[PDB]
Design an enzyme around this catalytic site. Sequence first.
Site, PDB file in Angstrom:
ATOM      1  N   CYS A 257      -2.433   0.478 -13.544  1.00 62.58           N
ATOM      2  CA  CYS A 257      -2.503   0.470 -12.093  1.00 62.58           C
ATOM      3  C   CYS A 257      -3.677   1.371 -11.734  1.00 62.58           C
ATOM      4  O   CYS A 257      -4.717   1.284 -12.391  1.00 62.58           O
ATOM      5  CB  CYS A 257      -1.173   0.909 -11.508  1.00 62.58           C
ATOM      6  SG  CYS A 257      -0.387   2.405 -12.289  1.00 62.58           S
TER       7      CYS A 257
ATOM      8  N   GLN B  71       6.509   7.796 -10.600  1.00 63.79           N
ATOM      9  CA  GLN B  71       5.848   8.864  -9.829  1.00 63.79           C
ATOM     10  C   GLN B  71       6.663   9.394  -8.651  1.00 63.79           C
ATOM     11  O   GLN B  71       6.345  10.479  -8.150  1.00 63.79           O
ATOM     12  CB  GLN B  71       4.506   8.368  -9.262  1.00 63.79           C
ATOM     13  CG  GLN B  71       3.366   8.376 -10.232  1.00 63.79           C
ATOM     14  CD  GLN B  71       2.060   7.836  -9.598  1.00 63.79           C
ATOM     15  OE1 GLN B  71       1.959   6.662  -9.213  1.00 63.79           O
ATOM     16  NE2 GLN B  71       1.081   8.699  -9.477  1.00 63.79           N
TER      17      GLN B  71
ATOM     18  N   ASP C 250       0.826  -1.215   0.000  1.00 63.93           N
ATOM     19  CA  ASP C 250       0.000   0.000   0.000  1.00 63.93           C
ATOM     20  C   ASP C 250       0.862   1.269   0.000  1.00 63.93           C
ATOM     21  O   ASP C 250       0.519   2.260  -0.646  1.00 63.93           O
ATOM     22  CB  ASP C 250      -0.939   0.027   1.218  1.00 63.93           C
ATOM     23  CG  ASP C 250      -2.305  -0.644   0.972  1.00 63.93           C
ATOM     24  OD1 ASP C 250      -2.527  -1.318  -0.060  1.00 63.93           O
ATOM     25  OD2 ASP C 250      -3.182  -0.497   1.857  1.00 63.93           O
TER      26      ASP C 250
ATOM     27  N   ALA D 104      -3.534   5.077 -11.659  1.00 61.75           N
ATOM     28  CA  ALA D 104      -3.440   6.183 -12.626  1.00 61.75           C
ATOM     29  C   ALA D 104      -2.808   5.789 -13.963  1.00 61.75           C
ATOM     30  O   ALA D 104      -2.904   6.556 -14.932  1.00 61.75           O
ATOM     31  CB  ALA D 104      -2.629   7.332 -12.016  1.00 61.75           C
ATOM     32  N   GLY D 105      -2.162   4.638 -14.041  1.00 57.89           N
ATOM     33  CA  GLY D 105      -1.512   4.218 -15.276  1.00 57.89           C
ATOM     34  C   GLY D 105      -0.186   4.926 -15.579  1.00 57.89           C
ATOM     35  O   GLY D 105       0.191   5.035 -16.755  1.00 57.89           O
ATOM     36  N   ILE D 106       0.548   5.363 -14.552  1.00 60.52           N
ATOM     37  CA  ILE D 106       1.833   6.019 -14.769  1.00 60.52           C
ATOM     38  C   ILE D 106       2.918   5.570 -13.811  1.00 60.52           C
ATOM     39  O   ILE D 106       4.100   5.609 -14.163  1.00 60.52           O
ATOM     40  CB  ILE D 106       1.709   7.558 -14.735  1.00 60.52           C
ATOM     41  CG1 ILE D 106       1.210   8.066 -13.377  1.00 60.52           C
ATOM     42  CG2 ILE D 106       0.796   8.035 -15.871  1.00 60.52           C
ATOM     43  CD1 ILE D 106       1.171   9.620 -13.237  1.00 60.52           C
ATOM     44  N   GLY D 107       2.563   5.146 -12.604  1.00 58.56           N
ATOM     45  CA  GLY D 107       3.591   4.795 -11.615  1.00 58.56           C
ATOM     46  C   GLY D 107       4.136   3.378 -11.666  1.00 58.56           C
ATOM     47  O   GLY D 107       5.182   3.138 -12.288  1.00 58.56           O
ATOM     48  N   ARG D 108       3.470   2.437 -10.979  1.00 53.22           N
ATOM     49  CA  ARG D 108       3.772   1.000 -11.166  1.00 53.22           C
ATOM     50  C   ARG D 108       3.791   0.595 -12.640  1.00 53.22           C
ATOM     51  O   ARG D 108       4.654  -0.181 -13.075  1.00 53.22           O
ATOM     52  CB  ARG D 108       2.744   0.151 -10.411  1.00 53.22           C
ATOM     53  CG  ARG D 108       2.738   0.419  -8.897  1.00 53.22           C
ATOM     54  CD  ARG D 108       1.573  -0.284  -8.193  1.00 53.22           C
ATOM     55  NE  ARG D 108       1.317   0.322  -6.886  1.00 53.22           N
ATOM     56  CZ  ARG D 108       0.347  -0.043  -6.038  1.00 53.22           C
ATOM     57  NH1 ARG D 108      -0.489  -1.018  -6.371  1.00 53.22           N
ATOM     58  NH2 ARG D 108       0.210   0.577  -4.854  1.00 53.22           N
ATOM     59  N   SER D 109       2.830   1.082 -13.413  1.00 52.18           N
ATOM     60  CA  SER D 109       2.774   0.762 -14.844  1.00 52.18           C
ATOM     61  C   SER D 109       4.048   1.204 -15.560  1.00 52.18           C
ATOM     62  O   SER D 109       4.584   0.488 -16.422  1.00 52.18           O
ATOM     63  CB  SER D 109       1.552   1.442 -15.476  1.00 52.18           C
ATOM     64  OG  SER D 109       0.327   0.912 -15.023  1.00 52.18           O
TER      65      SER D 109
END
Length: 282
Positions: free
Chosen positions: A215, A262, A181, A217-222
């Site tokens: 994920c 991010q 988390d 927002a589609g920018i960090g983990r992704s």
Amino acid sequence: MEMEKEFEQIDKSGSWAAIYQDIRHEASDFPSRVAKLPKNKNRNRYRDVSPFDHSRIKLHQEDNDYINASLIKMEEAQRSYILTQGPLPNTVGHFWEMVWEQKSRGVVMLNRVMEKGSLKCAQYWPQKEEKEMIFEDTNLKLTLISEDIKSYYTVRQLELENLTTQETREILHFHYTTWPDFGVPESPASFLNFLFKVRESGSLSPEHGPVVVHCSAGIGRSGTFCLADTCLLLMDKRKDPSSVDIKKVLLEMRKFRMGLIQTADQLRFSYLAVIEGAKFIM
Ligand SMILES: N#Cc1ccc(Cn2cccn2)cc1
């Protein structure tokens, strides 16, 4: 500089925040006018995360062709990815329409439906074989075929049917279930094992449309997922693997979608994953 020793040099000097801020300063800025039209407000999860106009995925619909999704096309590595936000209650049908129209084989999910006590994306796939889902706005039917639950991830086989033509396709759902988390994983070992499982399935290969990865927002983990994949592929292709510059690859990917990676902790984790992964490849 090489990667592993640039890495120890940033750790010893404690300058990850300064390296990461340089990337943010140099990143591309392109217009995202379609995303900001008023008719698309309920198609965006976050007001500060939008696809660029030049690389956005268009739905094959004449009413409204908008979805918060971008095509990342890596020319030297010969890989493409679609990065998108976690679907919203009013975009689950658009999401599966995109999967169909783009001929994707696999979907990569890097978040849980609930995290930190709040909903991070809609429950967009069926949980029981005998309870299929119908998306009436886009005329698609989705059925759970099988499910294999492991300690760090789950793989599901799904059947997607275009109800207009009665054509059917098999989609693989790769769900990484253990990202914490807060922060990033302590070791990249399970993330790399997951990446290799996606690769082995054929979902990242040129005989299919681009993989869809998301994920919240589609920018960090992704971003971490496609940055690590592309860097490892380049290290296999080139005569000199130590020439692969992860910051330059990241800036290239940020020409196609804003905000990839991010935090400075995600940047450090991406280095760690590529470094460890390069040893296992050989
Ligand atoms: N049975 C079956 C079946 C059919 C199609 C696919 C994936 N695909 C997308 C475009 C062409 N093929 C996967 C399984």
